[PDB]
Amino acid sequence: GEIQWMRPSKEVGYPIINAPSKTKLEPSAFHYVFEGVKEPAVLTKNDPRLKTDFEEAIFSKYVGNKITEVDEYMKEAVDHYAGQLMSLDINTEQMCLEDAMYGTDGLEALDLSTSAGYPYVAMGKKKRDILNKQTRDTKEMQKLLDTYGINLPLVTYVKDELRSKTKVEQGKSRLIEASSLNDSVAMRMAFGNLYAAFHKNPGVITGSAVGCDPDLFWSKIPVLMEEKLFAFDYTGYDASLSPAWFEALKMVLEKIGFGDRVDYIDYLNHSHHLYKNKTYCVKGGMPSGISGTSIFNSMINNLIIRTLLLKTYKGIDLDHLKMIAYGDDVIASYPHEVDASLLAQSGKDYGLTMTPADKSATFETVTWENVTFLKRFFRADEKYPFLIHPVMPMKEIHESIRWTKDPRNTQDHVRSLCLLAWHNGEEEYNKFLAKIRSVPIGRALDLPEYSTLYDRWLDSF
Ligand code: NA
């Protein structure tokens, strides 16, 4: 991903986009009951905590483009992945506007809280004014489609979230590229059934885990993996994607019956953005945030891993490559041990910056004991080993509970954390509940006890 140019939006006929400048995150009733070191991300150039230029920091993610064309390994990767997907008999017909808007089997309805993007954001027109979830009305939307069409600019927002001290001082805040409601709708109409087919088939065939339920899915993963596991993290995955990777994705889509609408991928690859009073053009880089983002990042990941294995290990049997991606996150396996370090090396030549799994300093062997997926470990249940617990460490949960974005969602926020934490065991869970109940706010919450969550878990399979 590389920014071609950037300039005042007025110079190209666009209005200044108003974005919030004050975080919605404030210390919660548990701020001093639990240990934590993260704070709200810098949202503006004037943030006192900054120790470097903000604008420069937030756009530096666009490391550039390392490859122009789709090489022979990539083509091979494309044929193999496309072949697997073929086995799912994915419905290739476009999805009607009604479902693309209000959802259907395998596809949730459009999120009414998220941005409507340009130009609605500049006309103060919200989604709540465009769609009727109880009416399933598509006339207003249809009229808007006909009026403003598609391929509209994406609106760049700084993500309001918790970040480490270092990242705050270095202005390393993450960005959200909200596509226009029109594009989101047109895209869900074009790829709606693909999205659904993926949501309904999380696994090693789609090579995707998007739409999955960790509590149930974790028990299916081990059975799908080959003997030897391997993994690694990416640095700035989305932004590092070169145009070739988008072209490789289009080839996959063509081969599975969607060659009919690969043009929509161009909108993602070569895209223009609106940020504050500026407008810029980017070549490459996946717009982090758009409808389809995680699924397409996941598909491209399947292409990347395959490409690197072909490039590094001629004769590798991709039919025994068992991997599951969630955007840039990935858990993979092969009957034989592979060198993540070597793969990482091959990765550089493809514009990908790969590093040791889970922030390690060196590339160590990945095992069922130390592997994580979506920040969760895998732990067989003590009483019924065939049931696998997705275990997220208490550290991130402690960090999260120390802040709130709205006092009205305190019980939902805390219940949410409880569904994640109890998997760490009863001793830990009870310690967690006790601290919560050491302050008034917590004692007033309705939280499930351990045995209740355990029973609920067993009854969910
Ligand atoms: Na782009």
Side-chain angles (χ1 to χ4, degrees):
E2 177 190 71
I3 295 179
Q4 310 284 276
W5 48 265
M6 178 180 284
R7 59 142 92 201
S9 305
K10 58 180 175 182
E11 286 171 37
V12 296
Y14 287 109
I16 302 182
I17 296 303
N18 298 306
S21 63
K22 184 190 167 192
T23 172
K24 292 292 192 59
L25 290 161
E26 222 194 53
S28 78
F30 316 93
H31 199 82
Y32 298 94
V33 176
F34 296 103
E35 284 166 40
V37 293
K38 295 188 176 178
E39 329 164 51
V42 174
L43 300 177
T44 60
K45 328 66 186 52
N46 309 308
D47 191 303
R49 299 172 301 173
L50 283 172
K51 288 199 171 304
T52 185
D53 181 63
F54 189 50
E55 314 279 286
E56 173 174 53
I58 65 172
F59 289 127
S60 68
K61 69 178 178 173
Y62 292 111
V63 298
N65 297 311
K66 183 79 180 180
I67 57 177
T68 309
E69 204 185 307
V70 175
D71 72 19
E72 295 304 303
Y73 302 97
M74 292 172 62
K75 297 190 176 180
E76 173 95 275
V78 168
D79 289 320
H80 184 269
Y81 185 48
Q84 286 191 185
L85 296 183
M86 210 61 63
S87 72
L88 297 163
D89 284 312
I90 305 170
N91 183 352
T92 65
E93 56 186 31
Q94 274 207 166
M95 179 177 285
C96 65
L97 177 57
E98 187 183 308
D99 295 345
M101 287 181 76
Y102 305 101
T104 179
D105 176 51
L107 181 62
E108 301 207 315
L110 280 171
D111 183 324
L112 291 183
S113 72
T114 58
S115 182
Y118 194 82
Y120 309 116
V121 66
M123 314 182 310
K125 188 177 183 66
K126 294 71 178 178
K127 292 183 176 183
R128 307 185 183 298
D129 316 310
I130 303 179
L131 37 164
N132 257 182
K133 65 94 176 180
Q134 66 307 291
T135 302
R136 279 227 163 194
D137 171 60
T138 64
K139 279 166 291 188
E140 170 73 325
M141 183 68 244
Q142 182 53 275
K143 168 191 289 291
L144 286 168
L145 282 180
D146 299 339
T147 294
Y148 305 90
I150 57 173
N151 213 282
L152 297 163
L154 291 60
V155 176
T156 301
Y157 289 122
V158 183
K159 195 169 180 293
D160 196 9
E161 57 183 358
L162 295 171
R163 307 292 278 162
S164 77
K165 176 71 70 178
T166 289
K167 285 178 186 170
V168 165
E169 285 170 347
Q170 306 178 318
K172 290 295 191 174
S173 296
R174 293 193 317 183
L175 300 176
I176 297 177
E177 280 96 40
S179 68
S180 168
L181 174 60
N182 286 31
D183 289 306
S184 178
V185 166
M187 287 204 69
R188 285 167 51 108
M189 269 199 273
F191 302 111
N193 294 315
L194 170 60
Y195 296 169
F198 266 55
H199 292 153
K200 303 187 69 194
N201 292 285
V204 295
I205 306 299
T206 59
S208 169
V210 187
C212 111
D213 177 354
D215 285 285
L216 298 171
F217 195 56
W218 251 230
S219 287
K220 303 182 182 190
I221 297 180
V223 189
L224 302 173
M225 297 295 91
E226 292 284 352
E227 180 77 38
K228 303 295 177 178
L229 302 184
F230 72 93
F232 44 78
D233 299 325
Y234 291 90
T235 296
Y237 182 85
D238 290 30
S240 70
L241 301 181
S242 304
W245 286 115
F246 289 89
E247 288 311 322
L249 171 62
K250 291 166 68 185
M251 292 176 178
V252 168
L253 294 175
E254 303 184 308
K255 299 178 180 290
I256 66 178
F258 288 81
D260 186 11
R261 28 221 173 306
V262 289
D263 277 356
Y264 282 106
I265 303 300
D266 290 346
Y267 152 85
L268 299 171
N269 178 8
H270 227 158
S271 60
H272 72 138
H273 312 255
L274 294 184
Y275 175 64
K276 257 72 173 187
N277 62 327
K278 292 182 175 179
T279 176
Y280 57 96
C281 181
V282 190
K283 181 186 175 185
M286 181 70 72
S288 302
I290 306 186
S291 189
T293 276
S294 46
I295 277 176
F296 291 133
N297 272 329
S298 295
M299 290 177 77
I300 284 175
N301 214 338
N302 276 279
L303 293 182
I304 291 166
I305 307 297
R306 287 180 172 65
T307 295
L308 301 190
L309 287 166
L310 294 164
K311 177 78 172 182
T312 308
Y313 300 116
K314 189 180 189 299
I316 192 86
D317 186 5
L318 294 183
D319 288 354
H320 278 289
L321 161 63
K322 297 304 175 179
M323 64 169 284
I324 307 178
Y326 190 104
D328 61 311
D329 197 356
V330 65
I331 184 174
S333 64
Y334 192 62
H336 303 283
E337 173 185 47
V338 306
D339 190 331
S341 176
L342 231 198
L343 290 175
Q345 170 172 291
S346 314
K348 294 170 190 172
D349 309 319
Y350 282 91
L352 300 161
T353 302
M354 298 150 50
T355 69
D358 304 325
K359 307 175 186 298
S360 177
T362 40
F363 285 105
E364 306 306 310
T365 307
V366 177
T367 60
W368 281 111
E369 219 286 310
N370 66 208
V371 69
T372 67
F373 189 44
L374 301 172
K375 298 165 299 172
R376 300 160 169 76
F377 288 77
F378 294 73
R379 288 297 183 279
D381 184 59
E382 205 250 304
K383 265 130 57 196
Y384 308 103
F386 45 87
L387 300 183
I388 307 301
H389 287 280
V391 187
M392 191 183 291
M394 294 306 298
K395 182 173 163 72
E396 315 169 12
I397 291 159
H398 286 161
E399 285 284 356
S400 174
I401 198 167
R402 300 177 67 248
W403 304 81
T404 177
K405 277 188 177 182
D406 172 29
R408 295 175 301 197
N409 307 318
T410 296
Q411 190 169 75
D412 296 324
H413 183 197
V414 179
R415 258 177 180 177
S416 281
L417 299 182
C418 284
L419 299 185
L420 302 179
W422 80 269
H423 285 290
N424 283 293
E426 174 164 41
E427 200 171 312
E428 271 302 293
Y429 189 56
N430 289 337
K431 289 182 186 167
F432 181 54
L433 284 181
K435 290 168 195 165
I436 287 169
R437 290 163 180 164
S438 70
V439 309
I441 292 298
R443 289 188 285 270
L445 298 178
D446 181 18
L447 306 175
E449 297 299 313
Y450 185 78
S451 70
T452 296
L453 292 170
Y454 189 77
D455 284 29
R456 187 180 300 173
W457 190 51
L458 300 193
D459 304 339
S460 61
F461 291 83

PDB file of all heavy atoms in Angstrom, residues 17-25 41-47 54 115 121 155-160 175-176 275-276:
ATOM      1  N   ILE A  17     -14.391  16.853   6.312  1.00  0.00           N
ATOM      2  CA  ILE A  17     -15.117  15.859   7.079  1.00  0.00           C
ATOM      3  C   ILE A  17     -14.875  16.082   8.556  1.00  0.00           C
ATOM      4  O   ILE A  17     -13.731  16.158   9.008  1.00  0.00           O
ATOM      5  CB  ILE A  17     -14.681  14.426   6.710  1.00  0.00           C
ATOM      6  CG1 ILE A  17     -15.035  14.133   5.252  1.00  0.00           C
ATOM      7  CG2 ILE A  17     -15.374  13.418   7.618  1.00  0.00           C
ATOM      8  CD1 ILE A  17     -16.506  14.295   4.930  1.00  0.00           C
ATOM      9  N   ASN A  18     -15.962  16.203   9.305  1.00  0.00           N
ATOM     10  CA  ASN A  18     -15.865  16.414  10.739  1.00  0.00           C
ATOM     11  C   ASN A  18     -15.774  15.082  11.462  1.00  0.00           C
ATOM     12  O   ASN A  18     -16.606  14.190  11.271  1.00  0.00           O
ATOM     13  CB  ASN A  18     -17.075  17.200  11.248  1.00  0.00           C
ATOM     14  CG  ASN A  18     -17.173  18.576  10.623  1.00  0.00           C
ATOM     15  OD1 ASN A  18     -16.217  19.358  10.665  1.00  0.00           O
ATOM     16  ND2 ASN A  18     -18.329  18.880  10.036  1.00  0.00           N
ATOM     17  N   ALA A  19     -14.743  14.950  12.284  1.00  0.00           N
ATOM     18  CA  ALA A  19     -14.539  13.735  13.049  1.00  0.00           C
ATOM     19  C   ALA A  19     -14.371  14.140  14.504  1.00  0.00           C
ATOM     20  O   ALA A  19     -13.909  15.245  14.799  1.00  0.00           O
ATOM     21  CB  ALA A  19     -13.298  13.007  12.556  1.00  0.00           C
ATOM     22  N   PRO A  20     -14.771  13.261  15.437  1.00  0.00           N
ATOM     23  CA  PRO A  20     -14.633  13.583  16.861  1.00  0.00           C
ATOM     24  C   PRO A  20     -13.152  13.769  17.188  1.00  0.00           C
ATOM     25  O   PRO A  20     -12.292  13.215  16.503  1.00  0.00           O
ATOM     26  CB  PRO A  20     -15.236  12.359  17.548  1.00  0.00           C
ATOM     27  CG  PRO A  20     -16.271  11.887  16.549  1.00  0.00           C
ATOM     28  CD  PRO A  20     -15.516  12.002  15.247  1.00  0.00           C
ATOM     29  N   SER A  21     -12.852  14.552  18.218  1.00  0.00           N
ATOM     30  CA  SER A  21     -11.462  14.791  18.598  1.00  0.00           C
ATOM     31  C   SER A  21     -11.212  14.432  20.061  1.00  0.00           C
ATOM     32  O   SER A  21     -10.079  14.492  20.553  1.00  0.00           O
ATOM     33  CB  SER A  21     -11.103  16.260  18.364  1.00  0.00           C
ATOM     34  OG  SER A  21     -11.890  17.116  19.174  1.00  0.00           O
ATOM     35  N   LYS A  22     -12.281  14.055  20.753  1.00  0.00           N
ATOM     36  CA  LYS A  22     -12.192  13.688  22.158  1.00  0.00           C
ATOM     37  C   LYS A  22     -12.645  12.238  22.317  1.00  0.00           C
ATOM     38  O   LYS A  22     -13.715  11.860  21.835  1.00  0.00           O
ATOM     39  CB  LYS A  22     -13.083  14.622  22.987  1.00  0.00           C
ATOM     40  CG  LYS A  22     -12.997  14.412  24.488  1.00  0.00           C
ATOM     41  CD  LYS A  22     -14.087  15.190  25.224  1.00  0.00           C
ATOM     42  CE  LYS A  22     -14.193  14.738  26.678  1.00  0.00           C
ATOM     43  NZ  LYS A  22     -15.427  15.253  27.341  1.00  0.00           N
ATOM     44  N   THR A  23     -11.827  11.429  22.984  1.00  0.00           N
ATOM     45  CA  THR A  23     -12.149  10.023  23.197  1.00  0.00           C
ATOM     46  C   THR A  23     -13.387   9.839  24.060  1.00  0.00           C
ATOM     47  O   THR A  23     -13.671  10.660  24.933  1.00  0.00           O
ATOM     48  CB  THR A  23     -10.993   9.270  23.879  1.00  0.00           C
ATOM     49  OG1 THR A  23     -11.433   7.958  24.238  1.00  0.00           O
ATOM     50  CG2 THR A  23     -10.547   9.993  25.135  1.00  0.00           C
ATOM     51  N   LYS A  24     -14.118   8.758  23.804  1.00  0.00           N
ATOM     52  CA  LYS A  24     -15.324   8.424  24.556  1.00  0.00           C
ATOM     53  C   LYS A  24     -14.951   7.504  25.716  1.00  0.00           C
ATOM     54  O   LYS A  24     -15.802   7.126  26.523  1.00  0.00           O
ATOM     55  CB  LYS A  24     -16.327   7.701  23.658  1.00  0.00           C
ATOM     56  CG  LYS A  24     -16.926   8.550  22.563  1.00  0.00           C
ATOM     57  CD  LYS A  24     -17.821   9.623  23.141  1.00  0.00           C
ATOM     58  CE  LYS A  24     -18.643  10.280  22.050  1.00  0.00           C
ATOM     59  NZ  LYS A  24     -19.482   9.263  21.349  1.00  0.00           N
ATOM     60  N   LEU A  25     -13.674   7.141  25.780  1.00  0.00           N
ATOM     61  CA  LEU A  25     -13.174   6.255  26.817  1.00  0.00           C
ATOM     62  C   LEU A  25     -12.793   7.008  28.083  1.00  0.00           C
ATOM     63  O   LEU A  25     -11.997   7.947  28.047  1.00  0.00           O
ATOM     64  CB  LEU A  25     -11.955   5.485  26.306  1.00  0.00           C
ATOM     65  CG  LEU A  25     -12.208   4.421  25.237  1.00  0.00           C
ATOM     66  CD1 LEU A  25     -10.909   4.102  24.511  1.00  0.00           C
ATOM     67  CD2 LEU A  25     -12.798   3.176  25.887  1.00  0.00           C
ATOM     68  N   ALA A  41      -6.207   5.939  22.600  1.00  0.00           N
ATOM     69  CA  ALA A  41      -5.297   6.280  21.517  1.00  0.00           C
ATOM     70  C   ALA A  41      -5.385   7.767  21.200  1.00  0.00           C
ATOM     71  O   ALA A  41      -6.436   8.389  21.373  1.00  0.00           O
ATOM     72  CB  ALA A  41      -5.642   5.464  20.269  1.00  0.00           C
ATOM     73  N   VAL A  42      -4.275   8.336  20.743  1.00  0.00           N
ATOM     74  CA  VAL A  42      -4.251   9.745  20.374  1.00  0.00           C
ATOM     75  C   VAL A  42      -5.221   9.893  19.209  1.00  0.00           C
ATOM     76  O   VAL A  42      -5.166   9.119  18.248  1.00  0.00           O
ATOM     77  CB  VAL A  42      -2.856  10.180  19.913  1.00  0.00           C
ATOM     78  CG1 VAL A  42      -2.907  11.599  19.399  1.00  0.00           C
ATOM     79  CG2 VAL A  42      -1.863  10.052  21.064  1.00  0.00           C
ATOM     80  N   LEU A  43      -6.114  10.874  19.298  1.00  0.00           N
ATOM     81  CA  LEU A  43      -7.102  11.100  18.251  1.00  0.00           C
ATOM     82  C   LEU A  43      -6.858  12.400  17.491  1.00  0.00           C
ATOM     83  O   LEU A  43      -7.505  12.650  16.472  1.00  0.00           O
ATOM     84  CB  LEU A  43      -8.509  11.125  18.852  1.00  0.00           C
ATOM     85  CG  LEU A  43      -8.995   9.875  19.593  1.00  0.00           C
ATOM     86  CD1 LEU A  43     -10.374  10.141  20.153  1.00  0.00           C
ATOM     87  CD2 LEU A  43      -9.031   8.673  18.657  1.00  0.00           C
ATOM     88  N   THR A  44      -5.937  13.227  17.986  1.00  0.00           N
ATOM     89  CA  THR A  44      -5.630  14.497  17.332  1.00  0.00           C
ATOM     90  C   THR A  44      -4.174  14.928  17.433  1.00  0.00           C
ATOM     91  O   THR A  44      -3.438  14.514  18.329  1.00  0.00           O
ATOM     92  CB  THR A  44      -6.486  15.647  17.883  1.00  0.00           C
ATOM     93  OG1 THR A  44      -6.238  15.794  19.288  1.00  0.00           O
ATOM     94  CG2 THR A  44      -7.961  15.376  17.642  1.00  0.00           C
ATOM     95  N   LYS A  45      -3.789  15.784  16.492  1.00  0.00           N
ATOM     96  CA  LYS A  45      -2.442  16.328  16.376  1.00  0.00           C
ATOM     97  C   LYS A  45      -1.991  17.065  17.636  1.00  0.00           C
ATOM     98  O   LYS A  45      -0.803  17.090  17.963  1.00  0.00           O
ATOM     99  CB  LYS A  45      -2.392  17.298  15.192  1.00  0.00           C
ATOM    100  CG  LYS A  45      -3.336  16.940  14.042  1.00  0.00           C
ATOM    101  CD  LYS A  45      -4.821  17.065  14.441  1.00  0.00           C
ATOM    102  CE  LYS A  45      -5.753  16.563  13.343  1.00  0.00           C
ATOM    103  NZ  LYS A  45      -5.389  15.186  12.879  1.00  0.00           N
ATOM    104  N   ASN A  46      -2.947  17.657  18.346  1.00  0.00           N
ATOM    105  CA  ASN A  46      -2.644  18.432  19.543  1.00  0.00           C
ATOM    106  C   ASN A  46      -2.578  17.662  20.854  1.00  0.00           C
ATOM    107  O   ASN A  46      -2.376  18.260  21.914  1.00  0.00           O
ATOM    108  CB  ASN A  46      -3.661  19.562  19.679  1.00  0.00           C
ATOM    109  CG  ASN A  46      -3.797  20.364  18.410  1.00  0.00           C
ATOM    110  OD1 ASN A  46      -2.804  20.834  17.853  1.00  0.00           O
ATOM    111  ND2 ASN A  46      -5.029  20.520  17.936  1.00  0.00           N
ATOM    112  N   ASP A  47      -2.745  16.347  20.799  1.00  0.00           N
ATOM    113  CA  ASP A  47      -2.694  15.545  22.016  1.00  0.00           C
ATOM    114  C   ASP A  47      -1.350  15.743  22.723  1.00  0.00           C
ATOM    115  O   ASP A  47      -0.291  15.473  22.158  1.00  0.00           O
ATOM    116  CB  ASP A  47      -2.906  14.067  21.687  1.00  0.00           C
ATOM    117  CG  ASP A  47      -3.123  13.223  22.923  1.00  0.00           C
ATOM    118  OD1 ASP A  47      -2.243  13.240  23.812  1.00  0.00           O
ATOM    119  OD2 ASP A  47      -4.171  12.544  23.004  1.00  0.00           O
ATOM    120  N   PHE A  54       1.887  13.507  14.413  1.00  0.00           N
ATOM    121  CA  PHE A  54       0.749  12.602  14.368  1.00  0.00           C
ATOM    122  C   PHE A  54       0.437  12.106  12.967  1.00  0.00           C
ATOM    123  O   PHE A  54       0.469  10.905  12.710  1.00  0.00           O
ATOM    124  CB  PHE A  54      -0.486  13.287  14.968  1.00  0.00           C
ATOM    125  CG  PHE A  54      -1.657  12.360  15.175  1.00  0.00           C
ATOM    126  CD1 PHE A  54      -1.491  11.141  15.833  1.00  0.00           C
ATOM    127  CD2 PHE A  54      -2.929  12.715  14.733  1.00  0.00           C
ATOM    128  CE1 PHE A  54      -2.572  10.289  16.049  1.00  0.00           C
ATOM    129  CE2 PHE A  54      -4.025  11.866  14.946  1.00  0.00           C
ATOM    130  CZ  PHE A  54      -3.842  10.650  15.605  1.00  0.00           C
ATOM    131  N   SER A 115     -20.785   4.159  10.785  1.00  0.00           N
ATOM    132  CA  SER A 115     -20.844   5.250   9.817  1.00  0.00           C
ATOM    133  C   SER A 115     -21.536   4.925   8.497  1.00  0.00           C
ATOM    134  O   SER A 115     -21.517   3.789   8.031  1.00  0.00           O
ATOM    135  CB  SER A 115     -19.429   5.753   9.527  1.00  0.00           C
ATOM    136  OG  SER A 115     -19.451   6.840   8.617  1.00  0.00           O
ATOM    137  N   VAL A 121     -22.457  11.406   5.586  1.00  0.00           N
ATOM    138  CA  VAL A 121     -21.805  11.957   6.768  1.00  0.00           C
ATOM    139  C   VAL A 121     -21.665  13.474   6.619  1.00  0.00           C
ATOM    140  O   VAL A 121     -21.623  14.202   7.608  1.00  0.00           O
ATOM    141  CB  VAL A 121     -20.397  11.330   6.974  1.00  0.00           C
ATOM    142  CG1 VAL A 121     -19.466  11.739   5.841  1.00  0.00           C
ATOM    143  CG2 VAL A 121     -19.827  11.763   8.306  1.00  0.00           C
ATOM    144  N   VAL A 155     -14.223   7.350   4.031  1.00  0.00           N
ATOM    145  CA  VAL A 155     -13.963   8.342   5.076  1.00  0.00           C
ATOM    146  C   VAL A 155     -13.047   7.747   6.129  1.00  0.00           C
ATOM    147  O   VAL A 155     -13.376   6.734   6.752  1.00  0.00           O
ATOM    148  CB  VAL A 155     -15.276   8.806   5.759  1.00  0.00           C
ATOM    149  CG1 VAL A 155     -14.970   9.753   6.916  1.00  0.00           C
ATOM    150  CG2 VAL A 155     -16.170   9.484   4.736  1.00  0.00           C
ATOM    151  N   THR A 156     -11.896   8.376   6.326  1.00  0.00           N
ATOM    152  CA  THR A 156     -10.919   7.902   7.293  1.00  0.00           C
ATOM    153  C   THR A 156     -11.170   8.424   8.709  1.00  0.00           C
ATOM    154  O   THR A 156     -11.282   9.631   8.934  1.00  0.00           O
ATOM    155  CB  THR A 156      -9.501   8.296   6.864  1.00  0.00           C
ATOM    156  OG1 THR A 156      -9.219   7.732   5.576  1.00  0.00           O
ATOM    157  CG2 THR A 156      -8.481   7.796   7.872  1.00  0.00           C
ATOM    158  N   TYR A 157     -11.267   7.497   9.658  1.00  0.00           N
ATOM    159  CA  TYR A 157     -11.496   7.833  11.057  1.00  0.00           C
ATOM    160  C   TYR A 157     -10.383   7.232  11.900  1.00  0.00           C
ATOM    161  O   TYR A 157      -9.837   6.177  11.567  1.00  0.00           O
ATOM    162  CB  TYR A 157     -12.824   7.249  11.551  1.00  0.00           C
ATOM    163  CG  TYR A 157     -14.075   7.908  11.012  1.00  0.00           C
ATOM    164  CD1 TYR A 157     -15.026   7.164  10.316  1.00  0.00           C
ATOM    165  CD2 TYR A 157     -14.321   9.271  11.214  1.00  0.00           C
ATOM    166  CE1 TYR A 157     -16.195   7.753   9.831  1.00  0.00           C
ATOM    167  CE2 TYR A 157     -15.492   9.876  10.733  1.00  0.00           C
ATOM    168  CZ  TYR A 157     -16.423   9.106  10.041  1.00  0.00           C
ATOM    169  OH  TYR A 157     -17.581   9.679   9.551  1.00  0.00           O
ATOM    170  N   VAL A 158     -10.031   7.905  12.988  1.00  0.00           N
ATOM    171  CA  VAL A 158      -9.027   7.358  13.878  1.00  0.00           C
ATOM    172  C   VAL A 158      -9.847   6.478  14.814  1.00  0.00           C
ATOM    173  O   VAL A 158     -10.904   6.887  15.295  1.00  0.00           O
ATOM    174  CB  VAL A 158      -8.330   8.447  14.676  1.00  0.00           C
ATOM    175  CG1 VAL A 158      -7.232   7.832  15.533  1.00  0.00           C
ATOM    176  CG2 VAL A 158      -7.765   9.485  13.730  1.00  0.00           C
ATOM    177  N   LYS A 159      -9.380   5.260  15.051  1.00  0.00           N
ATOM    178  CA  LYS A 159     -10.106   4.337  15.910  1.00  0.00           C
ATOM    179  C   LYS A 159      -9.966   4.727  17.381  1.00  0.00           C
ATOM    180  O   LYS A 159      -8.860   4.923  17.874  1.00  0.00           O
ATOM    181  CB  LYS A 159      -9.582   2.918  15.679  1.00  0.00           C
ATOM    182  CG  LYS A 159     -10.464   1.809  16.213  1.00  0.00           C
ATOM    183  CD  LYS A 159      -9.980   0.464  15.674  1.00  0.00           C
ATOM    184  CE  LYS A 159     -10.831  -0.697  16.166  1.00  0.00           C
ATOM    185  NZ  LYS A 159     -10.696  -0.902  17.642  1.00  0.00           N
ATOM    186  N   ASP A 160     -11.097   4.844  18.069  1.00  0.00           N
ATOM    187  CA  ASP A 160     -11.126   5.198  19.490  1.00  0.00           C
ATOM    188  C   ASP A 160     -11.002   3.907  20.291  1.00  0.00           C
ATOM    189  O   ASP A 160     -11.991   3.223  20.539  1.00  0.00           O
ATOM    190  CB  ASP A 160     -12.444   5.894  19.819  1.00  0.00           C
ATOM    191  CG  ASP A 160     -12.396   6.628  21.134  1.00  0.00           C
ATOM    192  OD1 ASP A 160     -11.289   6.747  21.701  1.00  0.00           O
ATOM    193  OD2 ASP A 160     -13.458   7.089  21.594  1.00  0.00           O
ATOM    194  N   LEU A 175      -6.403   3.362  12.078  1.00  0.00           N
ATOM    195  CA  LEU A 175      -7.407   4.062  11.286  1.00  0.00           C
ATOM    196  C   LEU A 175      -8.532   3.164  10.780  1.00  0.00           C
ATOM    197  O   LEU A 175      -8.362   1.967  10.596  1.00  0.00           O
ATOM    198  CB  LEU A 175      -6.736   4.751  10.090  1.00  0.00           C
ATOM    199  CG  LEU A 175      -5.660   5.798  10.391  1.00  0.00           C
ATOM    200  CD1 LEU A 175      -5.048   6.296   9.095  1.00  0.00           C
ATOM    201  CD2 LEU A 175      -6.277   6.960  11.157  1.00  0.00           C
ATOM    202  N   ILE A 176      -9.687   3.771  10.564  1.00  0.00           N
ATOM    203  CA  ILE A 176     -10.852   3.073  10.059  1.00  0.00           C
ATOM    204  C   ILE A 176     -11.238   3.755   8.753  1.00  0.00           C
ATOM    205  O   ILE A 176     -11.399   4.973   8.696  1.00  0.00           O
ATOM    206  CB  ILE A 176     -12.038   3.181  11.038  1.00  0.00           C
ATOM    207  CG1 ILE A 176     -11.677   2.510  12.363  1.00  0.00           C
ATOM    208  CG2 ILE A 176     -13.288   2.557  10.421  1.00  0.00           C
ATOM    209  CD1 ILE A 176     -12.768   2.636  13.413  1.00  0.00           C
ATOM    210  N   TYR A 275      -9.876  12.511   4.760  1.00  0.00           N
ATOM    211  CA  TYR A 275      -9.458  12.582   6.153  1.00  0.00           C
ATOM    212  C   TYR A 275      -9.437  14.040   6.556  1.00  0.00           C
ATOM    213  O   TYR A 275      -8.606  14.806   6.073  1.00  0.00           O
ATOM    214  CB  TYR A 275      -8.066  12.006   6.349  1.00  0.00           C
ATOM    215  CG  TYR A 275      -7.548  12.183   7.760  1.00  0.00           C
ATOM    216  CD1 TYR A 275      -8.178  11.566   8.834  1.00  0.00           C
ATOM    217  CD2 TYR A 275      -6.421  12.962   8.020  1.00  0.00           C
ATOM    218  CE1 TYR A 275      -7.699  11.713  10.131  1.00  0.00           C
ATOM    219  CE2 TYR A 275      -5.933  13.116   9.314  1.00  0.00           C
ATOM    220  CZ  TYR A 275      -6.578  12.488  10.363  1.00  0.00           C
ATOM    221  OH  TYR A 275      -6.099  12.626  11.645  1.00  0.00           O
ATOM    222  N   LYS A 276     -10.348  14.424   7.440  1.00  0.00           N
ATOM    223  CA  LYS A 276     -10.413  15.807   7.890  1.00  0.00           C
ATOM    224  C   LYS A 276     -10.675  16.722   6.698  1.00  0.00           C
ATOM    225  O   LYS A 276     -11.718  16.633   6.052  1.00  0.00           O
ATOM    226  CB  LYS A 276      -9.098  16.215   8.565  1.00  0.00           C
ATOM    227  CG  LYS A 276      -9.129  16.264  10.092  1.00  0.00           C
ATOM    228  CD  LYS A 276      -9.188  14.885  10.730  1.00  0.00           C
ATOM    229  CE  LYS A 276      -9.041  14.997  12.250  1.00  0.00           C
ATOM    230  NZ  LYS A 276      -8.927  13.677  12.938  1.00  0.00           N
TER     231      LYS A 276
END
